[PDB]
Design a binder for this molecule. Structure first.
Ligand SMILES: *C(=O)[C@@H](NC(=O)/C(=N\OC(C)(C)C(=O)O)c1csc(N)n1)[C@@H]1N=C(C(=O)O)C(=C)CS1
Length: 258
């Protein structure tokens, strides 16, 4: 608590301007300082579960030789809307690793469904999160304030730190997870818009419908100092700009010059 919100930032006003709810957690892994605004509230995961899904696939690959290179063929019935990579390989198949990269880097929806099958579904992914110490994450599916398919900004950040910088994955798989996040293409207007171009950054986004429920989590490597891990989640007013604005406030609250 002593290193949390050492520097106040105007998150409440940003949230009022947005009209919905915003949740933010950011940690400076060098000092332990944090910034936290609604950080323990539940927000919809939307597609952000797919980063953790890819990590779970990598963890499984430590025990299951050949998993990543396994070819997966699927039918047209698997191609739900917003499957921009998998729809181009319907007639050929894709490997598990390719599906993972597509889920992470293009938020390919069909690819994520196919990988969830590999893990035994939402409960399997939830079990992986429990296995790394995350008691908040819940994926339920394949209501106002619906708790299904939610986590908190804090738990998302803590789990992201364990997987990308800590020991939850073996080193080769950790670096592959980082590389997948670094190559994401869907986040240029979110956390990345608050981060200087000469800093490395990996992220995964989520967008639930068009009304402003959206999110992003990222690892950021400022040059010359320890990495920062952060998560920004929103619930729509009854947003891409708001996420970037909240990330800027989080970095400012950590004293990180951008
Ligand atoms: C993950 O968040 C995916 N999102 C969706 O499939 C949903 N909506 O997609 C759009 C295109 C916004 C829609 O209005 O249909 C959705 C609605 S409710 C729910 N649980 N998901 C993909 N991921 C991203 C991202 O930001 O990573 C998108 C930009 C949309 S597709």
């Amino acid at each position: 608590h002593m290193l949390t919100n050492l520097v106040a930032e105007p998150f409440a006003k940003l949230e009022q301007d947005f009209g919905g709810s915003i949740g933010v957690y950011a940690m400076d892994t060098g000092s332990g300082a944090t910034v936290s605004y609604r950080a323990e509230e539940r927000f919809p995961l939307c597609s952000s579960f797919k980063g953790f899904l890819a990590a779970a696939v990598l963890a499984r690959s430590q025990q299951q030789a050949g998993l990543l290179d396994t070819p997966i063929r699927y039918g047209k019935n698997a191609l739900v809307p917003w499957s921009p990579i998998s729809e181009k390989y319907l007639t050929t198949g894709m490997t598990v690793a390719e599906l993972s990269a597509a889920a992470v880097q293009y938020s390919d929806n069909a690819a994520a469904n196919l990988l969830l099958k590999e893990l035994g579904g939402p409960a399997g992914l939830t079990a992986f999160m429990r296995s790394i110490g995350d008691t908040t994450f819940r994926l339920d599916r394949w209501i106002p304030g619906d708790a299904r398919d939610t986590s908190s900004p804090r738990a998302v950040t803590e789990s992201l730190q364990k997987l990308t910088l800590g020991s939850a994955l073996a080193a080769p798989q950790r670096q592959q997870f980082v590389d997948w996040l670094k190559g994401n293409t869907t986040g240029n207007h979110r956390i990345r818009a608050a981060v200087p171009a000469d800093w490395a950054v990996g992220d995964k986004t989520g967008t639930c419908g068009v009304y402003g429920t959206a999110n992003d989590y990222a690892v950021v490597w400022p040059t010359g100092r320890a990495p920062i891990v952060l998560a920004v989640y929103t619930r729509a007013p009854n947003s891409e700009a708001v996420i970037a604005a909240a990330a800027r406030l989080a970095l400012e609250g950590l004293g990180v010059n951008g």
